[PDB]
Amino acid sequence: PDPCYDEHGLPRRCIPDFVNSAFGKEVKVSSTCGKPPSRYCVVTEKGEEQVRSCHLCNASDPKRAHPPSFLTDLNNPHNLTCWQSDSYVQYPHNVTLTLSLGKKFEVTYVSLQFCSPRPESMAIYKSMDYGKTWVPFQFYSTQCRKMYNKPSRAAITKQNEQEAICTDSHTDVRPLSGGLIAFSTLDGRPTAHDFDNSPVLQDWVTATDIKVTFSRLHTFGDEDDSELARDSYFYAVSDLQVGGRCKCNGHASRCVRDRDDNLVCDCKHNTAGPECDRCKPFHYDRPWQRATAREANECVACNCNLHARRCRFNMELYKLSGRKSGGVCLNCRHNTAGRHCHYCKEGFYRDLSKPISHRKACKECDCHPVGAAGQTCNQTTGQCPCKDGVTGITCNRCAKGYQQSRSPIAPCIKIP
Ligand SMILES: *[C@@H]1O[C@H](CO)[C@@H](O)[C@H](O)[C@H]1NC(C)=O
Ligand SMILES: *[C@@H]1O[C@H](CO)[C@@H](O)[C@H](O)[C@H]1NC(C)=O
Ligand SMILES: *[C@@H]1O[C@H](CO)[C@@H](O)[C@H](O)[C@H]1NC(C)=O
């Protein structure tokens, strides 16, 4: 039935399936050819020598068009579909593709398959917010310092596992077609074998949005002086994939769509939030944790003895509890008061025929106006303070050895 839970009832860690989060998703592209229609030449090889061809890009024409929708469409090797950029975009100048996922993902690989020859310099970035800000995932260039101001193949140390390497790898042509770029978020990082227990990595792989930027271009022609180049140079890619899973903090087996049309974890274990990053309301007894293989870490309910609908977590009480219970109740109802709403407030006492949860569990003090030396009774017992000859819970009768008078000042008087 439910993978988020045991054979019997018990919370166990759960993860959504690894998928290609890009598939069929519309990517935004800085440029697309065919408006206005345009000719493009491509120089290529029969292995010993250079052969050059020519073609047209027409947005209008399906057979001769190349939309951004071809980046994520179903990839068939034998029948290829390529997005193609404009021409005469080249350093400085970049073509940029961004993919909004609408929700936070754990990204394993970002991978590209190029129709043109691969870029001399390109960069992958991610966004953790919703497309406001961008931090570098990885750089690719022949000259790293000159292009991106990054050292060449910088070692990754435990000290910083979140820096982006810039490599000269995957900058080569050949291939002038079908070159792959595969970026791995966890590759060469010292705590990756430990990922589940490695928060900084768990942060690293977390993205809402993914951006690819192509900067410098190979010139495969390749006259000096005044050369109005006979050859156009562009960027063309048949496939863009980002592999990974919806980020649920181990608290969900799946993500789903809202009544508000938003992708969110279908959150289990008494958790809430788009990432399951925090506890569901009234569930504040212990603090929030990421589910692990060893520990499910379900948010547990506050105990209000059915007298309060909201509570808050107190870390200090949690600690002094032996890290057992930290919740305290808010705005107890039904004339109760205290951490757990476990006692009646002043002016009331605890009727002990009724269970602590009972809505009537706290009776109003009924303290007899004449036989009692004061109005507020004992919260736990119900006993009113009793003037000298008087007894009863309510201070309503005379003791043995005492006789009743008609006086409101002195109701019970000792015999001889
Ligand atoms: C592009 O192809 C379309 C086919 O619908 C054709 O009508 C047009 O003449 C071609 N060139 C353009 C759009 O100028
Ligand atoms: C290539 O794919 C398109 C997609 O509709 C199809 O119309 C076309 O016939 C395919 N070409 C071949 C040779 O299979
Ligand atoms: C193009 O890329 C440069 C460096 O790649 C980047 O700083 C810039 O934001 C991009 N284009 C713009 C915004 O002019």
Ligand SMILES: [Ca+2]
């Ligand atoms: Ca394609």
Ligand SMILES: [Cl-]
């Ligand atoms: Cl093409």
Ligand SMILES: [Cl-]
């Ligand atoms: Cl390579």
Ligand SMILES: [Mg+2]
């Ligand atoms: Mg092409």
